[PDB]
Design a protein around this ligand. Structure first.
Ligand SMILES: *[C@@H]1O[C@H](CO)[C@@H](O[C@@H]2O[C@H](CO)[C@@H](O[C@@H]3O[C@H](CO[C@H]4O[C@H](CO)[C@@H](O)[C@H](O)[C@@H]4O[C@@H]4O[C@H](CO)[C@@H](O)[C@H](O)[C@H]4NC(C)=O)[C@@H](O)[C@H](O)[C@@H]3O)[C@H](O)[C@H]2NC(C)=O)[C@H](O)[C@H]1NC(C)=O
Ligand SMILES: *[C@@H]1O[C@H](CO)[C@@H](O[C@@H]2O[C@H](CO)[C@@H](O[C@@H]3O[C@H](CO[C@H]4O[C@H](CO)[C@@H](O)[C@H](O)[C@@H]4O[C@@H]4O[C@H](CO)[C@@H](O)[C@H](O)[C@H]4NC(C)=O)[C@@H](O)[C@H](O)[C@@H]3O)[C@H](O)[C@H]2NC(C)=O)[C@H](O)[C@H]1NC(C)=O
Ligand SMILES: *[C@@H]1O[C@H](CO)[C@@H](O[C@@H]2O[C@H](CO)[C@@H](O[C@@H]3O[C@H](CO[C@H]4O[C@H](CO)[C@@H](O)[C@H](O)[C@@H]4O[C@@H]4O[C@H](CO)[C@@H](O)[C@H](O)[C@H]4NC(C)=O)[C@@H](O)[C@H](O)[C@@H]3O)[C@H](O)[C@H]2NC(C)=O)[C@H](O)[C@H]1NC(C)=O
Ligand code: CA
Ligand code: CA
Ligand code: CA
Ligand code: CA
Ligand code: CA
Ligand code: CA
Lengths: 154, 154, 154
């Protein structure tokens, strides 16, 4: 009976927590984050080389963005559009040229290459083994040593 | 009895959640957010026309700021003061000139017009049917096509 | 029995809350925050005098940073490194020259003074009674009237 009073009080605390949490997720993601399913993408609003971006995302507790669907890709395109800066994705063809994989090593389940890309031609930058996403959502292979918007996936 | 052990464990988890949540609300609102009652105002730190600001706030899961009291208005004034940029509020007199309403269509329950305002005179901008808030908290009717600080209400 | 169903449902809600909360802490701290133990440090990304920084942190619900260990100090150094701007710490020697204390008045349990510091010589700024932290983590006594990165502790 007293136990009953305790779980009804827990129900009220839990529901208030859920309400307040729904609100603070929306507050937190405004404006530099987007949620898709269980994933959250968030930009730090600065640019780094691919290598430094990788360290930054891991150190923060996440990883670089691996868009596995149109919906996830659109969310990233929304972030780079707002920031007006193209962002590095997680994927590279470093192990095998022309074959872009996630950092786990599996092949892409989704791809949105711009016309003509990937082309592995960064001019004076040499080969292009990383991937940038444009405001329109399209992808281009870019040299990993370039500076691009950092977006992390959590 | 075992059930008793389970709710006492729930009590501990709930309380730790409440403690950590109180802290992460303060962390999140620092420095671009303010809480007042059940409302949270947060600025994105960029400027947009009223129309674009409306889309941005809705898309993010909220709406534009509708200050219904002195306390809510002060919180907004704190945000525009920090950003040093005047912000659009939610209210317009688009439906009826001189009669400012919330987006629901109800009349203001609170108003803080600067001296002489509203005046519906944006010079070359034409009529003024939206509302900007100044660092001092005072209001001026401004053309909706101007760019002003975006603050959203959640 | 029905009570049993209610606490098992609470267990599921609590665990989902804990999972989502772990994720939104990491999202929130990226990139301007760091957690150490029960503390969270977060920079606002602007500069203020020591006096104004104190007001800002208190008003936000926290206080200025009081690094009490190497780990806490490193977290601050990570924030000023990212921002490329030295930050004020909480400690002053205002009450007694050469004796730096926390705002509670207790002496430092940890210190990381740069070589030669503290020296109480701000040139035209006069005496130096506050403390700045550099990107390398080292400390220098600086005049309290200077503008430095604002980091708050929550
Ligand atoms: C770029 O480089 C990568 C790395 O080598 C290559 O990745 C491979 O892509 C192929 C083609 O789609 C893919 O094969 C398909 O796998 C599907 C899923 O089932 C497979 O994995 C499960 C485990 O999750 C196994 O239990 C299944 O039996 C399948 O096992 C695969 O079998 C093949 C031999 O038939 C073997 O070569 C693979 O190593 C092995 N994979 C794994 C993970 O065990 C199937 O439904 C479908 O029918 C295909 O078999 C394969 O999984 C990828 N390999 C790896 C290592 O991930 C790309 O081929 C290459 N090129 C491109 C264009 O991306
Ligand atoms: C600017 O433009 C707007 C839109 O037309 C006008 O808004 C109206 O403001 C008036 C004046 O304050 C306001 O009337 C007061 O309403 C108070 C609340 O009670 C009313 O609403 C409840 C429901 O919440 C009803 O159950 C009550 O019976 C009241 O109903 C109102 O009755 C009047 C006729 O007497 C009718 O014209 C209204 O449409 C109707 N409102 C609603 C929502 O049902 C009362 O305590 C108080 O005594 C006043 O009656 C009225 O509610 C506003 N109308 C709307 C559509 O929201 C402004 O008049 C106009 N000018 C300014 C200066 O803002
Ligand atoms: C800069 O300015 C400050 C402010 O005056 C001075 O702070 C003092 O530092 C000393 C030296 O370390 C420190 O004394 C040590 O305290 C340790 C902890 O135990 C003391 O506090 C507990 C309560 O938490 C008491 O129950 C203990 O009995 C100790 O009490 C202290 O006793 C001394 C007399 O023996 C007395 O003068 C203190 O006021 C008193 N402190 C308190 C808080 O009650 C001990 O383990 C250790 O053996 C030392 O005694 C002392 O606590 C600090 N005082 C204050 C007010 O915080 C610095 O000396 C000065 N210089 C520097 C270099 O920082
Ligand atoms: Ca390549
Ligand atoms: Ca290319
Ligand atoms: Ca008007
Ligand atoms: Ca006006
Ligand atoms: Ca001094
Ligand atoms: Ca000095």
């Amino acid at each position: 009976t007293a136990l009953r009073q305790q779980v009804e009080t827990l129900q009220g605390q839990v529901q208030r927590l859920q309400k307040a949490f729904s609100q603070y997720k929306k507050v937190e993601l405004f404006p530099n984050g987007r949620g898709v399913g269980e994933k959250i993408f968030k930009t730090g609003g600065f640019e780094k080389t691919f290598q430094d971006a990788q360290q930054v995302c891991t150190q923060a507790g996440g990883q670089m963005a691996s868009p596995r669907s149109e919906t996830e890709n659109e969310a990233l395109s929304q972030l780079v559009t707002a920031q007006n800066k193209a962002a590095f994705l997680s994927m590279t063809d470093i192990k095998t040229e022309g074959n872009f994989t996630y950092p786990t090593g599996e092949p892409l389940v989704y791809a949105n290459w711009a016309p003509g890309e990937p082309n592995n031609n960064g001019g004076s930058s040499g080969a292009e083994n990383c991937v940038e996403i444009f405001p329109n959502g399209k992808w281009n292979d870019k040299a990993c040593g370039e500076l691009r918007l950092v977006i992390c996936e959590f």
